[PDB]
Ligand binder design. Sequence first.
Ligand SMILES: *[C@@H]1O[C@H](CO)[C@@H](O[C@@H]2O[C@H](CO)[C@@H](O[C@H]3O[C@H](CO)[C@@H](O[C@@H]4O[C@H](CO)[C@@H](O[C@H]5O[C@H](CO)[C@@H](O[C@@H]6O[C@H](CO)[C@@H](O)[C@H](O)[C@@H]6O)[C@H](O)[C@@H]5O)[C@H](O)[C@@H]4O)[C@H](O)[C@@H]3O)[C@H](O)[C@H]2NC(C)=O)[C@H](O)[C@H]1NC(C)=O
Ligand SMILES: *[C@@H]1O[C@H](CO)[C@@H](O[C@@H]2O[C@H](CO)[C@@H](O[C@@H]3O[C@H](CO[C@@H]4O[C@H](CO)[C@@H](O)[C@H](O)[C@@H]4O)[C@@H](O[C@H]4O[C@H](CO)[C@@H](O)[C@H](O)[C@@H]4O)[C@H](O)[C@@H]3O)[C@H](O)[C@H]2NC(C)=O)[C@H](O)[C@H]1NC(C)=O
Ligand SMILES: *[C@@H]1O[C@H](CO)[C@@H](O[C@@H]2O[C@H](CO)[C@@H](O)[C@H](O)[C@H]2NC(C)=O)[C@H](O)[C@H]1NC(C)=O
Ligand SMILES: C[C@@H]1O[C@@H](O)[C@H](O)[C@H](O)[C@H]1O
Ligand SMILES: [Fe+3]
Ligand SMILES: [Zn+2]
Ligand SMILES: [Zn+2]
Length: 341
Amino acid sequence: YTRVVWCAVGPEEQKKCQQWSQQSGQNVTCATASTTDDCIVLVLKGEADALNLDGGYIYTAGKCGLVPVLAENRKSSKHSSLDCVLRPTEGYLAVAVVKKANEGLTWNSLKDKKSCHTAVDRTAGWNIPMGLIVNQTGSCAFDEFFSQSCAPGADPKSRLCALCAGDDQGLDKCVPNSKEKYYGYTGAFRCLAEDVGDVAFVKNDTVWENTNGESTADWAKNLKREDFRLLCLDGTRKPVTEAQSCHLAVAPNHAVVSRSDRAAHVEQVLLHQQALFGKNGKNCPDKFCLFKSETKNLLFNDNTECLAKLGGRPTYEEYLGTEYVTAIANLKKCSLEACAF
Ligand SMILES: *[C@@H]1O[C@H](CO)[C@@H](O[C@@H]2O[C@H](CO)[C@@H](O[C@H]3O[C@H](CO)[C@@H](O[C@@H]4O[C@H](CO)[C@@H](O[C@H]5O[C@H](CO)[C@@H](O[C@@H]6O[C@H](CO)[C@@H](O)[C@H](O)[C@@H]6O)[C@H](O)[C@@H]5O)[C@H](O)[C@@H]4O)[C@H](O)[C@@H]3O)[C@H](O)[C@H]2NC(C)=O)[C@H](O)[C@H]1NC(C)=O
Ligand SMILES: *[C@@H]1O[C@H](CO)[C@@H](O[C@@H]2O[C@H](CO)[C@@H](O[C@@H]3O[C@H](CO[C@@H]4O[C@H](CO)[C@@H](O)[C@H](O)[C@@H]4O)[C@@H](O[C@H]4O[C@H](CO)[C@@H](O)[C@H](O)[C@@H]4O)[C@H](O)[C@@H]3O)[C@H](O)[C@H]2NC(C)=O)[C@H](O)[C@H]1NC(C)=O
Ligand SMILES: *[C@@H]1O[C@H](CO)[C@@H](O[C@@H]2O[C@H](CO)[C@@H](O)[C@H](O)[C@H]2NC(C)=O)[C@H](O)[C@H]1NC(C)=O
Ligand SMILES: C[C@@H]1O[C@@H](O)[C@H](O)[C@H](O)[C@H]1O
Ligand SMILES: [Fe+3]
Ligand SMILES: [Zn+2]
Ligand SMILES: [Zn+2]
């Protein structure tokens, strides 16, 4: 009744979820699926209650009647007066990132280069950059723009998966879960850093979190911010310090979603879980921390300070905003109102 079933995507989220479940005295239990879409289907059936979604997936889920419940909020320099839970969310910066050493690569010379995407259907990794590229090219053949990519969730035999690596054993090439080596923000940035691709479509925060000693992960140990450049829409290249003047869009924060009839109960439970396991929680450093997973963004983004109440009790369309929503609608007309399942 007052027990919430979390949906985990893939085996590593399942493991973190199992630890959370144990620590919460089974106030939270876990269902697992191989993809985010499969998790949304579990929620629709009533077999799971909730999961934290990227903006692009909130759009999929919303068309099926799921609703935003609480949003990730990270640290801000403005609005510092208000408590984290009550503070408005700011949104993250979607950016395109290249190596400094790859000279003369600009936004206007991306055609036939190698790209690294978080996953198909995601905001910074897919919807924003491909929407821009479709508009600019006047063509829906975005699968022929780049010579080779890693875009988890695309056909494994296509060029959109050519650069994906799969797991330790080479299995699960291009699956949109953290088994794929180049999945997610961190995976797409790794694909760039290892020089598999020429450009990575990620958010501003990923670059900072994985450079200048901020990670310690073996591939990121020695990465320096100065070795990277952002691509701006005016054809220039800028240091990573200038993302406020050199980004592709501001994205709505990742948010917990649930079935409408469950929303109120999911919200109550999660507010109490973060008091126990969130940033300054009673049990975090000691027993368990909800918002940590060694740079791997499992369940929630590691930079999350708290989950925030929404206010204006927004629908999915209001939460995402009219800007972003019409961008996805236009791109989706390349690949009609209804749930996708
Ligand atoms: C791209 O992504 C990166 C990564 O996410 C991001 O950089 C991070 O941004 C955070 C800032 O928003 C960084 O700050 C945090 O970490 C520092 C560690 O050094 C901590 O140190 C202090 O924290 C205190 C308390 O919060 C700060 O004091 C606050 O209060 C004062 C009141 O006087 C205010 O200062 C003012 O700030 C304004 C606006 O910036 C400035 O113009 C004024 O001149 C004035 O000085 C302000 O409210 C302060 O926050 C104190 O100043 C220190 O910050 C904190 O805990 C802090 O929260 C975080 O470290 C960054 N991460 C990393 C890894 O580098 C980028 O911002 C992002 N870029 C874009 C464009 O979004
Ligand atoms: C790829 O290209 C496509 C096609 O161009 C883009 O889709 C278009 O995006 C436009 C920008 O979002 C969009 O423009 C319209 O803008 C109006 C006005 O926006 C207003 O903002 C005001 C803030 O000052 C605010 O006061 C207003 O309330 C309002 O929000 C929006 O309203 C119009 O629509 C009404 C339709 O009946 C009309 O009555 C009214 O007078 C306005 O004209 C409107 O919703 C819309 O956002 C445009 O509609 C989109 N075009 C098409 C054909 O769909 C994508 O964004 C591009 N992709 C990317 C990633 O950039
Ligand atoms: C699991 O959830 C329960 C229910 O919310 C928590 O126990 C409740 O504690 C509150 C006050 O803190 C009481 O008002 C309720 O009576 C309790 N519920 C019942 C029926 O036991 C409990 O703290 C949670 N446990 C953990 C570790 O998260
Ligand atoms: C936290 C939440 O975030 C967005 O939905 C809006 O900016 C809104 O104003 C705020 O309440
Ligand atoms: Fe995202
Ligand atoms: Zn902007
Ligand atoms: Zn409303």
